[PDB]
Ligand binder design. Sequence first.
Ligand SMILES: [Cl-]
Ligand SMILES: [Cl-]
Ligand SMILES: [K+]
Ligand SMILES: [K+]
Lengths: 819, 825
Amino acid sequence: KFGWIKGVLVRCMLNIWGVMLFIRLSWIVGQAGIGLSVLVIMMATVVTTITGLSTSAIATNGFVRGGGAYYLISRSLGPEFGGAIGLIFAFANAVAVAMYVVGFAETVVELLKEHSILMIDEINDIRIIGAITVVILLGISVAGMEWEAKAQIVLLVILLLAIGDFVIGTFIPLESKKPKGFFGYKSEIFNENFGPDFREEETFFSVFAIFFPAATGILAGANISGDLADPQSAIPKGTLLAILITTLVYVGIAVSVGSCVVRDATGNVNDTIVTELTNCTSAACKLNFDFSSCESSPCSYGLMNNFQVMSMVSGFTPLISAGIFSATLSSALASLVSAPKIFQALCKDNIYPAFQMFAKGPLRGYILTFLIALGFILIAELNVIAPIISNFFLASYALINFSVFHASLAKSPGWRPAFKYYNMWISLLGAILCCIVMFVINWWAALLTYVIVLGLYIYVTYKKPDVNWGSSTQALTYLNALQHSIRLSGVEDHVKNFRPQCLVMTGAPNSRPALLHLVHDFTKNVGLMICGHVHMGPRRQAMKEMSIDQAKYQRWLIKNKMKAFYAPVHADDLREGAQYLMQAAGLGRMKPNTLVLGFKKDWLQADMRDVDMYINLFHDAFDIQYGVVVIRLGKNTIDVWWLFDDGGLTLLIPYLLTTKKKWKDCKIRVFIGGKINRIDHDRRAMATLLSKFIDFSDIMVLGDINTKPKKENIIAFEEIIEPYRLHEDDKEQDIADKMKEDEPWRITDNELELYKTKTYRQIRLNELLKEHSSTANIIVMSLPVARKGAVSSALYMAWLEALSKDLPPILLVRGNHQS
Amino acid sequence: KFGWIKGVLVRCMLNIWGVMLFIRLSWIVGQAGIGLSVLVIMMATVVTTITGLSTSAIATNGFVRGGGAYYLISRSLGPEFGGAIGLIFAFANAVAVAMYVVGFAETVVELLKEHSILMIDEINDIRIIGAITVVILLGISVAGMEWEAKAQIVLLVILLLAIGDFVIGTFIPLESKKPKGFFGYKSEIFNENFGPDFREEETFFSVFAIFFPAATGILAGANISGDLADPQSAIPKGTLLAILITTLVYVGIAVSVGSCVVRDATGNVNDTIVTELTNCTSAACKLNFDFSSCESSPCSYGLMNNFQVMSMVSGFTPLISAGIFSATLSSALASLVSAPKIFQALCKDNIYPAFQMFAKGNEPLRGYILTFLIALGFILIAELNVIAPIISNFFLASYALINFSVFHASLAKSPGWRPAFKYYNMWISLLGAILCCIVMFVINWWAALLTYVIVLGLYIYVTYKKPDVNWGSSTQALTYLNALQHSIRLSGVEDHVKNFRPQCLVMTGAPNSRPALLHLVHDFTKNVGLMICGHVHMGPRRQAMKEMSIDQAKYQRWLIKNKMKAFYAPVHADDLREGAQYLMQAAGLGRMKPNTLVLGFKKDWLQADMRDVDMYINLFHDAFDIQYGVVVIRLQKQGKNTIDVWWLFDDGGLTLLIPYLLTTKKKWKDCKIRVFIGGKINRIDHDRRAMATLLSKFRIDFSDIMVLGDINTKPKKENIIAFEEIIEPYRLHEDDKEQDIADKMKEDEPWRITDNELELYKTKTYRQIRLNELLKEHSSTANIIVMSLPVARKGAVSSALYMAWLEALSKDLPPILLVRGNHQS
Ligand SMILES: [Cl-]
Ligand SMILES: [Cl-]
Ligand SMILES: [K+]
Ligand SMILES: [K+]
């Protein structure tokens, strides 16, 4: 709504123009020459303008919401890059507050000192002034924000008036100021000052580090507003014009003041000499006064001895002092307002669990910024505070540049910048340049910040995959999931690599959570697991019914650490819903390949037409070549049994179960029955086969299964199966037919006589399980197959019941006959 | 075929004991004290033992077939980490060859200088001898490959005997050597030597950096060999015993030579202090053979000045000379045979395509040449104190990489990555990686910065830029798990906002006959949404699975070749409607489920059997019941002419959303969106301003908007007549025919166009015809025309009539789209 001139340009100029303009720029152009100071300014401008290009490319995506720098970085790029940059930038602003207020306090200290007033000491006076100013600025930061927009332009015009006052006063040389080194545009002085004169321990990159804060603040200005009209258009123009204007002004002032004042001089109005020109080495040869003592012994005034040379050279000192005040305070306030906001946004997004508290809306953010600022203000020296802010802001800018380059390098799903002059290789160059300069200024601090950065990046990317942590950009999650699924579909598995992709169908999802938990146990990071539910009734209400049920069951599953996808369906009967889930559900390679059906607990009482369709589900699944699993219900062991191996799924499942922590204590015992003569050969061959795939200790072989079982179990079988026996032998054929055609689902007696052997052997198998595997936590066998049409459903399920009569947890697993 | 001792212990120990045991360790205990030199040794041992634990953890996994170091790291861990580590380690070994050869040259030139023979200079003589010896080592690397294993134990026993000779000689002081500063185990010497004395500008980490390559060589002993039986058990025990033995010998030798020789001496037996005692302050107060004069000026003998103290204190010097030759040559040969193999294996794996020349066989024709040139270039720097730091740098880089790779793979368990080795703790490995990194920055911060810049560049290039690199390993499990994780993340959070992406199910109904429909459907679902194709299988089930799998394979490879991002979803059913219902109701994994339907226009509905048309109308009705958006497409133009859309009602913004998505694509950018509404003539201005607001809020540009109120006008006679002949074949003729026969015919063919329906909906037909005429007149130039799909309640309308309306609206027109959202915002 603001526009761009009042929304970015003004904000960026007031954030950029800070302490260094009117305090250390003279000192910097004194230490180094005009040439290397201009090179310093150009280096800073190059770093800031490359970062400006990267930011403009960031801000031209369609994600234009919220209104905060961290918001743009997080929503356009990954959450982890967003979090890292947000935290580091928040800290950088928290310390920049201290820098600006310390500069202001130093100015007030000197201003009082030149007068009669004074306090206990310079350093302690700086501490007191900085603390009180920080208190006042924070107090303003939460109340007077309704006036900052009005006062913004006033501050900028006052700052510009101060710059104009300095430049105008430059052109008016006076004899009063001449002792202090202010001569005025003399080619001898320009020649003297053009060369480096690093006097104290400082070097090139020390002055570069002390100056860089003169160019930091491009993001802090406008991007954090994000409430502009057409943010896709305000930011790229505003930032890239603010940078140009500020750099031009900096270079102009540097060259001018370097060409206007001599390196060091004293305030002695005497010392004027015209007597001799013996040496006249100094650039003050016109007079030369007696600055030889100044260069040989300590002297107060000069270019380097005192930093407020701009105050003296100016025509009017109150105006330039007001300029310094405004330049420091505006940027201090901007930083102290932009740090807690990022802290609060980070807390709300809850990227870092330690920072999960927002103080009920953001006392935590203000308290952190205040404590960091006050802690650093206790250092009352500015040439030692400037480098650490330089390091933190180079860290932020390097991270932004590399993040943009990386999001472009990997064709990220939601990275279409739509900007001109944004080549990603330039961004990579900016990143490496920032890192190298960070290291050259101070290698160990750069190392420390970068290990912190890498730790944060890895921690966020990997150690937090669970809930997405309040990410409003669930659209980016959708895009990433779509890309992942597309990539998986593209990858064609010539070898199927059969993984457990279950389709668990039970009816009421919450009736038997035990089956779901057991399925969870062997479906951890190995394959898919889709629930199922067929909903009967009119479609009009059913639409709302599944609309609610999908949500309710999916988050009920999620809260149980369940990787469950709910797949509700509407059908005229259970079999139709089974078919719908069976043939359609599953995208690309995530196609379910196993059907896990919950066993009927009380089929005795329920009408057995339902039994018929529940059993026909087995044939329907088999006809499509689905592995069939049926379930019925650490301290003990496990038992695995089978009569055949078709794909090894029956053997593979317990291996998957044991690998988990809960079942780690449990152990698998092999339980089979083979030829009595070939017990040793079969045992050795199967032990070798298992070893080829899985440790084992014992292999029980029960080759006696062929003979008839005990009388009691057989009897119980007949008193189980009698009610639906055809009675074809007992009744008359034609008389029986009147029941057969209208009741064709009766237990086929002819099958009973034909399948006596199957009944006997399966009953004996159940018995042997009873004696042997009673103590096992869970038992596993191969699910018997009854051919369609040849065998009635009722007989098959009677066989199943006899197989699973009064036993601990029991599973029946048959593979799909595919390797 | 080797076992613990001869397979790992011998190789690791004879690789570890290299050049600095007998050349620089005396000088190291000189520069530092006993305490600080022992601290240096312990720090190097800590770094190397943490790396040994991590290497053991890598080597204890099941991947045991190939038998190679780089093979091992690459197969157990990611291909990107494998490639980075392989390249860095190959370079490190190539430089280590130069180091060991330089040590050999220095020792031999010193020996010759002991005699009359002397080339131009020590430095130049080292240069020449390094050249000849490295070429000889290159020759014997390939020529003498068969019998090296026999000389293995010969060299090891010679080295052991050399150490024994040194330690025995330590216990027999001789008068003739005492001038050279060699006493025997004197307490004052020990007390003097416990404190640091850094003569040159070198500091603690300078001597540490020089010393470190005395502790490196653990990997190349056994991991590179590979072909040793039971490696999973041999490698850990063998390497972690070699480290212990060698470190114990290093501490013993350091403390023994630091407590037995004075820092600086002179080979003159004159001016003993026992005659005249001034202060006796020096630690050599016992004799003080005029060593006080050696403080002012350096001396040719002593513990600091002489780099062959181990050859002086020892008993029989030639044995120690032979020991030095043996250790240096053995380590040099091990490095020179390990490097080319890594280069060749890496190039064969094709991780970095630029290195193509080296892939040539069977032996690498160019890899040996590359390592020979690197070694020959580096040995030209005669000084060894200036070669050691860079080998230290590269080996520290490799060890940090191994430790961090193992830690990361432990943090990201997605691959198999089962260690099975106790003492695997990933926190210890991380600590080792950090220690290596910071210690390597403490030495040549800029060299280490360059090394990490290059390492990160290699890693990023291999992992993200490369579409896929699985030539050796084909786990393909990370993709599955990441896709599953993203799917659950998407399906987990409940968002009240609809988030109405366009999710389209397209049922072409043909095997591959209709590609451009797929292309157009993909244009507006390329990154915004999801696209699922359709295919229904007619026939018996028993042959269905194989045929449909083959069809899926061919169409998927075609889509990959067609650069299509879509999913093939086959289904088996009796008829098309059944398959369509199967796909609509039970397709979609979580939130990635279709919410709109795309159907191909029936070109030959007139000629085709009416049963198909009735089924197709039933398919529309089924889609409507489920509340999905319906898009009917019929027709290749990309940028020739503008795009026109003529919607009369808004249903969730789909009518306006689809054209925007189409325009956003690069190949449609050359066209312009133009709306064409037919509304009240009196309220043209209101309609225009409202639609301008609508487009602005939905972010669409409009060339010009015109409102027409002529829809209500009766259509011209010729169009009505033409529609009459179009509908005549299916006319019911209920009024014209008798009631009884008409009802019988209706019972036989209930889909016949009811005359009552035509009479009732005559207004609908007339408005449709007028709309068709207006579209033909106005939007003829535009390549593609989009408008609302006509719809009526089922039963009250005939399938023939509905299809006739659709045909009329899409008669002799450019690309035509009829869109109707699911009535949801
Ligand atoms: Cl500033
Ligand atoms: Cl060595
Ligand atoms: K600033
Ligand atoms: K070594």
